Amino acid sequence: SVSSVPTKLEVVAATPTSLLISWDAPAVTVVHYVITYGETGGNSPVQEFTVPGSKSTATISGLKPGVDYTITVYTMYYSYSDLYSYSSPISINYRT
Amino acid sequence: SVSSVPTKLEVVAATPTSLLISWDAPAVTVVHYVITYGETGGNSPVQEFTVPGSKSTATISGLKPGVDYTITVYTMYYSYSDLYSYSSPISINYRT
Amino acid sequence: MIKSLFAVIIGGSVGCTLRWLLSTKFNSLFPNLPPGTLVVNLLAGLIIGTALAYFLRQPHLDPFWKLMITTGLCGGLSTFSTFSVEVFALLQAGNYIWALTSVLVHVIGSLIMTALGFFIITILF
Amino acid sequence: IKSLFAVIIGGSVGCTLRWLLSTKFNSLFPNLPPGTLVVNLLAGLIIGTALAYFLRQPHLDPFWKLMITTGLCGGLSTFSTFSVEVFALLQAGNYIWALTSVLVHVIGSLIMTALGFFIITILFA
Ligand SMILES: CCCCCCCCCCO[C@@H]1O[C@H](CO)[C@@H](O[C@H]2O[C@H](CO)[C@@H](O)[C@H](O)[C@H]2O)[C@H](O)[C@H]1O
Ligand SMILES: CCCCCCCCCCO[C@@H]1O[C@H](CO)[C@@H](O[C@H]2O[C@H](CO)[C@@H](O)[C@H](O)[C@H]2O)[C@H](O)[C@H]1O
Ligand SMILES: CCCCCCCCCCO[C@@H]1O[C@H](CO)[C@@H](O[C@H]2O[C@H](CO)[C@@H](O)[C@H](O)[C@H]2O)[C@H](O)[C@H]1O
Ligand SMILES: [Br-]
Ligand SMILES: [Br-]
Ligand code: NA
């Protein structure tokens, strides 16, 4: 009855080509966070990368200036009941 | 199944009033050895004492000169199947 | 030694199911060191320490119950594999301070629950 | 309830294994009973490999992960027996092997879990 999804995802610092995101870690043992980001406009390949579980911030670069991106985040965590499983995602939109 | 009883119980050095006995340890985690000594003719209080498992020799003292004594030694050992338990004894007789 | 086998199953089943119920209800409460897997290990440690100093005083008990309690219950109740994943996970997550702490508490606590159960019964008697 | 059978059938097999391996082998090296150890390394192995596998196949029935983890591994492994032995050695003034037994069980079981996990992880690549 304990959620593995992160909470309070927001952009704390931004540049024209990079977003800085922050999240509240779940009350689980997170092995790593998987960040996914893609241009909110249709068929721009969604790109993804991971962040260690001990961190709760991440940088995203290579973005075009003035574009709305969809930033989503989930976890690969350990629980007694499931071992290594992936959590549901938490998404936000931020426009550079 | 391995035996838990010592072997080669014997007086290695005697005086009139003391016996240096020794034995060989069984192939079991022996917590401590118990030595019992009394006058062979069932006419005297039987005395017992303990010696650490890390020792395989004991001293019997206060003996009467020229008297036959029955000396026996058993173990209190750990085995997987019986946890703690006492071994059957190994007895010898010796005249001081 | 088929009668011997039922002792392992009955005892273990209890110890397992017991371990299973406790871990689901309580493990999530404190993840840096799940308490469910710790209580069963302390519990079995407590039990086996008592079984130690009581079996000693009862040389003629049925090899049946001794099996069902130690190998069965305590064996099935306690766990070492589930102890390893939690540490392995705290290590993959770079949570060394807790991974190391989890190792210490389990080992020492289990030996104290053993020391307790042994010396409580040695002292009652 | 269906989950209950997994823990039982799983723990039963594991406990039955831990029993047979412990009786037949423990008595050969008292300083470090090897039956109580292999079951631990073997369960530590199984759980590590189970860890990495159920990740790659994230949608398989929860029944099989339960029977293998909390059952098999939980039943196969043991902490109480590891406790008594160490406590037995500690009681016997055998501090050297009491310590060694603690290390080899932990370090080894952890190495086995990492080994189980990392093999599978390297396999899927
Ligand atoms: C006694 C022996 C002790 C040493 C045991 C080995 C410890 C060091 C592992 C080095 O290899 C690692 O392999 C990981 C893959 O298995 C990679 O993880 C990457 O991918 C993982 C997911 O597969 C993520 O969780 C990680 O955060 C991400 O860094 C990681 O880069 C790489 O260095
Ligand atoms: C004494 C007993 C020994 C028994 C054997 C123990 C084996 C432990 C294996 C741990 O696995 C590795 O742990 C690293 C550390 O947690 C992870 O690094 C990940 O996390 C680090 C810190 O969070 C980051 O710096 C890395 O880049 C990132 O790959 C790495 O992925 C993971 O495979
Ligand atoms: C990491 C911590 C784990 C939790 C704590 C576990 C403690 C377990 C040991 C307690 O039992 C005592 O150990 C002593 C030492 O082995 C024994 O001394 C016995 O053996 C000694 C051997 O030197 C003799 O000197 C003593 O007189 C003799 O009583 C003593 O009988 C025994 O009751
Ligand atoms: Br497990
Ligand atoms: Br046990
Ligand atoms: Na177990």
Residue numbers in the entry:
A (entry chain C), B (entry chain D): 1 to 96
C (entry chain B): 1 to 125
D (entry chain A): 2 to 126
Paper text:
Microbes are protected from the cytoplasmic accumulation of environmental fluoride ion (F-) by export of the toxic anion via fluoride channels known as Flucs. These small, homodimeric ion channels are remarkable proteins in two regards: first, their unusual ‘dual-topology’ architecture, in which the two subunits of the homodimer are arranged antiparallel with respect to each other, yielding a double-barreled pair of pores related by twofold symmetry; second, the Flucs stand out among anion channels for their extreme substrate selectivity. In contrast to most characterized families of anion channels, which tend to be non-selective among anions and sometimes poorly discriminate against cations, the Flucs are arguably the most selective ion channels known, with >10,000-fold selectivity against the biologically abundant chloride. The protein possesses two deep, aqueous vestibules with an electropositive character due to an absolutely conserved arginine sidechain and a deeply buried sodium ion at the center of the protein.
To test whether any of these densities might better be assigned as anions, we endeavored to crystallize Fluc channels with bromide (Br-), an anomalous scatterer. We were unable to generate diffracting Fluc-Bpe crystals in the presence of Br-, but we were successful in solving the structure of Fluc-Ec2 in the presence of 100 mM Br-. Anomalous difference maps show two prominent peaks, located in equivalent, non-crystallographic symmetry-related positions at the bottom of the aqueous vestibules. These densities are coordinated by a sidechain that is invariant among Fluc channels, Ser81, along with the highly conserved Thr82. In maps from previous Fluc-Bpe structures, a positive density occupies this same position between the homologous hydroxyl sidechains. This site is exposed to bulk water in the vestibule but is likely to be partially dehydrated, with aliphatic sidechains, including Ile48 in close proximity to the bound bromide ion. In order to test whether this anion-binding site is part of the fluoride permeation pathway, we introduced an I48C mutation to Fluc-Ec2 and assessed the effect of modification by a bulky, anionic, thiol-reactive reagent, (2-sulfonatoethyl)methanethiosulfonate (MTSES), on fluoride conduction. In planar lipid bilayers, I48C mediates robust fluoride currents, which rapidly diminish by ~50% upon addition of saturating MTSES to the cis chamber, consistent with full modification of a cis-facing thiol in a population of channels with oppositely oriented pores. One anion-binding site, identified by the anomalous diffraction of Br- in the Fluc-Ec2 homolog, is located at the bottom of the electropositive vestibule and is sensitive to mutagenesis as well as modification of a nearby sidechain with the bulky thiol-reactive anion MTSES. Taken together, these experiments show that the anion-binding site at the bottom of the vestibule is on the fluoride permeation pathway .
